[PDB]
Symmetry: D3
Subunit: 204 residues, 6 copies
Amino acid sequence: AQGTLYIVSAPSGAGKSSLIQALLKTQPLYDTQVSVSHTTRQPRPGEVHGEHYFFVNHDEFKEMISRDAFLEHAEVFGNYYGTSREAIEQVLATGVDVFLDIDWQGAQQIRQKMPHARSIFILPPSKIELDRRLRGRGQDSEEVIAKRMAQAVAEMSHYAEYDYLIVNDDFDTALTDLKTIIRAERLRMSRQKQRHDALISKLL
Amino acid sequence: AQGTLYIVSAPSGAGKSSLIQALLKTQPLYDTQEAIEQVLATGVDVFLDIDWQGAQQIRQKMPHARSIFILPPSKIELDRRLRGRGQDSEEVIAKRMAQAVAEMSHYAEYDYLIVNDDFDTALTDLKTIIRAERLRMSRQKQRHDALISKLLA
Amino acid sequence: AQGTLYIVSAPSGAGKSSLIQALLKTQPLYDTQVSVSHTTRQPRPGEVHGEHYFFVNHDEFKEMISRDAFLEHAEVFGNYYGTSREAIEQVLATGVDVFLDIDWQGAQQIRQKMPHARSIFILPPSKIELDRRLRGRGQDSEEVIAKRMAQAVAEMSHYAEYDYLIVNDDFDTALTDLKTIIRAERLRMSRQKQRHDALISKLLA
Amino acid sequence: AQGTLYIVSAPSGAGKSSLIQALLKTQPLYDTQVSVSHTTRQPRPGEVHGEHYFFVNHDEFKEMISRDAFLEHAEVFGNYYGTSREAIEQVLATGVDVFLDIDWQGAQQIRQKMPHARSIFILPPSKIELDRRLRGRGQDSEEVIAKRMAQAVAEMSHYAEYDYLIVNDDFDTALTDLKTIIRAERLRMSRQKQRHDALISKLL
Amino acid sequence: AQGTLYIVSAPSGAGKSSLIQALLKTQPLYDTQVSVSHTTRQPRPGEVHGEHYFFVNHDEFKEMISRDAFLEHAEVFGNYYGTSREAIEQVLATGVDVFLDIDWQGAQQIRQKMPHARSIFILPPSKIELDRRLRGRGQDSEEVIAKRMAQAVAEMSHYAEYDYLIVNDDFDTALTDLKTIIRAERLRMSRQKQRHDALISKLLA
Amino acid sequence: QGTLYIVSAPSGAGKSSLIQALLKTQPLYDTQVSVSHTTRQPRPGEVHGEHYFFVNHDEFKEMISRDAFLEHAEVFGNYYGTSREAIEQVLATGVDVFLDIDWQGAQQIRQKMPHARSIFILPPSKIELDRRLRGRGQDSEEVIAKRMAQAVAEMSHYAEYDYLIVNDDFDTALTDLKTIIRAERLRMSRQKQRHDALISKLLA
């Protein structure tokens, strides 16, 4: 019946997105889905309304802000982004687990209005490795790198606010850790009593 | 530092003991095994094989202990498994089947529930729970103290 | 030399097509392929002839129908849909395993003209779960749901007509079951005698 | 309800015994067992009646041969060895799969009186590898090696009589091949119809 | 700091490209990448510069040829294709492993000038199976087949020049073999000392 | 064709359990443990050949003289050393050999066996090493410091080795050890050997 909301946070260079993406390629829609943000920006090539984003007009957004329709929202680089409340609750009602990819700030807003939500934080395996991963292609000014490293340490500060902690050294290991958390939760008494209603009847 | 106490219950014919065994064969003593609290203080996870009675007594004086209940995949399969070798009086079977049903009644009192159909799958489920708990913030913060420092300054 | 034909049937909500797709992403073309179906309809965005369907004319389709150029066919929602017999026997000749995704009807038609073909039936883990899976996104009329649930029961009735039965609870497990069946068949004497001809000579010196 | 009887044959140097032992270490008794042979020979240290054999006296064995209670029996280096039909039938009745380890002679005898039994033949990956494995510890006379190799080729001749064929190159892969066979058989309509009776009702 | 360059060769029919492809779907960019390769032809739809190819002028390409800016190159169905020395060294400097898919010829040129580089050769499990995979769809002239088989044998000749050897029987096993090599190399003392610098300090205080 | 694996690690790295686990899932014609030579007394169950190569204090002295050992020392009275005859006999049969020793014996063996490869196992952190070293948690702080000192001495000849496994998760670590073995078996040298017959047919 009721799905779980998983809040996933991480600094840039922990593989947070790659990881949530990998997990979805091996799991049906009736089991696990990615949360879909509302945004004001222009769709890019490939992007489709309903899948990558809920693309709406600057006006439609402000209506939604005023009628407290979002669970969290923020302005970024010139456009508005937020996670609809209605969108999340509908999916959960069908018994699907939802992955919400956000920063520590959105996290606390959701943990607030969604106290049943669980939260997972991903970290890099060392400072050196995080540096390396942040440097991406290796063609960036030392001043843009230090600003990215600063932003990362800011993110990582709120790590203790979270329910689970994954250290992402080996990608595969980290993906199994994520899969493990999902599976273990589905073995909680609450949901097993639901999923096995018929069987548990026959035995008793 | 601090380990977890796993209370494991199940009726006969669920595989409770065989399962806890198989799990101890691929896991070092510094990870999984008064006498209870000593081990837990060394950061080891303890598996306590008992019945619903013991369970409630331990849930009592050990409120931080987590509990796992194992069930047969059907009543037909439970019957079969209970019958063991197939050389038993039909009246000793029913007494075994009764005791099992009495056990299964208390399943809702537990934290986790494994349905043991495929033994391999059930063994993974058990491991999964173990791993998931070790990923909790409490325990990871402990185990990664040094790393977390380096990342923040 | 000789490949196998795998008839896969299942009611909506068992994961039948997602399963067959997942299987194809981890298996080369010289080992496993899905049947491709001749259609008379329009190729939408992404859809190409050969890969997605074998898009043909209404006339070209109507010719094929006359000279028995089909393994199964009928009419759905406006157009014409059929599974070509020549296209099957060709791929099977090259030693490839073929997956034929259909309903219980085409199944009996094929079990007929392909008595050597094996059949796999996938089922949901319970009625409650079936209901839920069928309800898809959860924005559908109770009457359209009951019509789907009905159609599913009708399909499920024919289950015992099949060689293997997979209960699709955990998707991953179900996928391994599908693979296990595939692997086990290739372990049969018939095909192993073939595949290891060189080695079996040397040992029997 | 009804389990399968698995006749397993192989030449020395294929890993036939190790394999079956490996399989039994990760499977409960209510699913898979090995067959236990009647014998007239003396139990060694560790060997127990009911586990490693069915140790009987010469006359008891003869009574049996007489009343056709065996599914096979031979005379080796001085003693008798047999497969009680009662012992096998009892276990299959409980729905357990049985693994019977024998030569090609026993195979045909059983194929005969047990037409529903399946047979698996394991082969070495090459004659060079077979030689090597047969040499065991590397301390044997060339005329004892040649007699074992001769015996091996004699055994491998009957390979075509079997249902499945496993090429044991990598031990782990071959063990998966064996496990694969078991699992695929359990997926047959015959046994699945049985195991999921309760569910198939509810669905209809 | 230093990534390894993996030179991968195989005859047609070993699944060399499918293997490298499969490997990249389960591995992050900051761990493993495919070679770019500079070319002169037209950027089709979806095909970005930097990602799919390093597209350039027939002039810019001609300059690069003169000042030995390439690792290998030739002419194919009209245009110019080649992989650049600079493009490889840049990626390996960020600690990424690079997969270069080439023939024995380019292999030798690269063994020659490339520092941290290892080579892997893939082979079919038999001649009958190599035949079958080469026959592809099954609709080819016995003379085009003999020409593809001749080219294959020419390719398999140089197998002994290579560090590792994968026999591609079962595709999944073969992909595990490839993954195994990648992992083992990252367990070498050279790279582990690098990756675990902070940890090794603390242990040695 | 075979390979000798030198495995070293400080106490609390899992070195023994790891080599033990590796042997249970692998046949004798593929992988074995090194049987070392000693002068002391055969305890109950301990068979010459299996557990040790037990020799007279004199036979051991002969063997030290004509440089028959790969490594040796004195321990709590007696003499312990690596029999190079025993090693070479096995490797000749194409079996990989595992040698559990300290950094001292290592160099002695890297010396007379330059083709042998070396693996070093480390604990995931100092805190975890401490905890693992504290075994049951009933030891004097001075017996703990003496073992932690002995570890750090052992843990500093690490660069001398070919491969480095960090044993955090026991299962991950065993996969690492298995990975190394497999990757070595995929070397051209040994693959030319094992697939000789196949490579002929291909180049027809």
